[PDB]
Paper text:
[name] crystallized in space group P 1 21 1. The catalytic region is composed of 442 residues and forms a substrate binding cleft and a semi-closed tunnel-shaped active site, with both the (α/β)8-TIM-barrel and the CID, similar to other chitinases with CID, the substrate binding groove is partially closed. In our structure, the FnIII-like domain is linked to the TIM-barrel through residues 476 to 484 at the opposite site of the catalytic region, defined as FnIII linker loop. Residues W137, W123, Y53, and W50 are located on the extended surface at the entrance to the catalytic cleft in [name], suggesting that this [name] works as processive chitinases towards the non-reducing end of chitin41 predominantly releasing disaccharides and also monosaccharides at +1 and +2 subsites, as it was recently observed with purified ChiA7422.
Most bacterial chitinases belong to the GH 18 family (GH-18), and share a TIM-barrel fold in their catalytic subunit, have a conserved DxDxE motif, and employ a substrate-assisted catalytic mechanism. In particular, [name], a [name] synthesized by a Mexican strain of [name] subsp. kenyae, has been shown to synergize the insecticidal activity of Cry proteins, and to generate chitin-oligosaccharides with antimicrobial activity. Our data demonstrate that this enzyme has a modular arrangement formed by four domains: (i) the catalytic region with an (α/β)8-TIM-barrel as a core structure, (ii) the [name] insertion domain as a barrel insertion, (iii) the fibronectin type III and (iv) a chitin binding domain.
Author numbering: 40 to 571, 582 to 674
The structure:
Amino acid sequence: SQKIVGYFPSWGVYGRNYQVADIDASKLTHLNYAFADICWNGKHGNPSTHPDNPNKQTWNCKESGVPLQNKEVPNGTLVLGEPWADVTKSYPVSGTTWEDCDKYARCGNFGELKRLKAKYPHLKTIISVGGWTWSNRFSDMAADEKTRKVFAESTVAFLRAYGFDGVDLDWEYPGVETIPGGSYRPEDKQNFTLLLQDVRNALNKAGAEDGKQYLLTIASGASQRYADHTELKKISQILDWINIMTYDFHGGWEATSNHNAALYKDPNDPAANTNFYVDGAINVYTNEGVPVDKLVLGVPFYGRGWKSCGKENNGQYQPCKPGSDGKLASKGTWDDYSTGDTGVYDYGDLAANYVNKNGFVRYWNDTAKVPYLYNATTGTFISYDDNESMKYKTDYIKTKGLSGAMFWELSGDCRTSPKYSCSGPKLLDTLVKELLGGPINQKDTEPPTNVKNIVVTNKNSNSVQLNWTASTDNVGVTEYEITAGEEKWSTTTNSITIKNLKPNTEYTFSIIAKDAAGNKSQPTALTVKTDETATFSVTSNWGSGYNFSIIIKNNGTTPIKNWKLEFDYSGNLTQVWDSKISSKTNNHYVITNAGWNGEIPSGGSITIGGAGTGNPAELLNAVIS
Ligand SMILES: [Ca+2]
């Protein structure tokens, strides 16, 4: 079974004019969204003004229009890369109010992804973090137990809030300096493993609460050097899979012409012995102990170009000279006065304007199995991938036993765009035909999330009114079924009124959420007695047990010293913090202080916490004495 994981660039929605709606998600199993960032000292971004940093800008993390970030944000927090594009921008006919986008971050690209998953109900969404520009703080965050925890907890909250199915870590690169000013340490090797364990544990906890199986992945470096600075074998066992970046092996940072993503060893390549080609890199990974089913092969939807390059061997493996601007790289598709020359071409741009056009001639290396363009007149050389080379790579994926293909990125395929119109065959259709056999046409298999925070809104001798937090689904939640002994009820909203009940009777109500395809959540329950200050709240809940909280308010004309809470609860409580359980009889409970919780002022509140087993009930007949 094969995977197709596509990268969506946040910034594609501006000049490149590639919107979420444009995406045909029948051709994907997974969509990675690039990028989110790490908060540090109240800002995020990379402030380095070194020339290898393409985005020398930082932003404050505190954002009044984003509920999760409407506060002083602590160090290590996962934060939105660009709030306007990510959650603030309003999209026409989406159903969003002004308040939803303006103060609740329910709009933007994340809103569009929610609509996309509904349209294509097999699709799983991942938030990618870091990347080349925003990897400056991973080392700092991973070096301390406290910032690893903050990061892992923020990741779980991010996923829940904005509807992602997992997180992808793109740390470029542990223990090595990429952009001067960025943090990196040798202990990054042990600390990268600790971070992934800390994230995985957090995701497992939350997946049990939520009824989801959350995914964890990384994007890793295709070199022995990356292997030498990480514990690949260990991390392969923690992750769902590894997106190996088997591209950018060579480009306009070097003075010899070469291939961006060569598949096999070409001995005629001066750099053959560095293993900077696909099969070399896979051999590096397998030799480290990485199972080949844990690798998803990266492929590029772009090419790389040098501006002035020697004429022998049709431009291949020749010396290159810089231009008037001092750079070796040619003027790529999206390059302008502010970017300078980056040598990066969308495949679309190449196919519409460069392949056997404008003086560029296509040649084929039948050893490396990749194409390249050379213009004898200008001296410009371009390494790229096409449908022919893509078909060789899909054959490799199937023969070597890799588990899929990842590609960078969605907007670079043959499309019509503000700067080119390509009408020829699409790289992505090659990946689909070759790895899946054809577009995916599957039904919803993803169940809705578990019901939470069941409360009794009102109670009667013969009736009860229940409310709960609405569950979520990828397509939508159609109804809730409530059971108690022999009886059954249902509702299309997250509340119900139940009538015709025996007075002074104990009932245990189990609630599950359904979707249209017929999936369902796992039951959650609450115990209620019909009729004839301490407020009890449930902080976290898996099936078997839950964490709780009690706030004790003093409405007194005196201070409360050595307080003792007495109440009855038709349920079992196991552990209490900031408190001790004095006694129990027929679900009646006596609780006492921890000695430094003795004093509660009149109008003051003492807050204590505990855990329980089974399902929650209602704290009743409470007294403070
Ligand atoms: Ca579903």
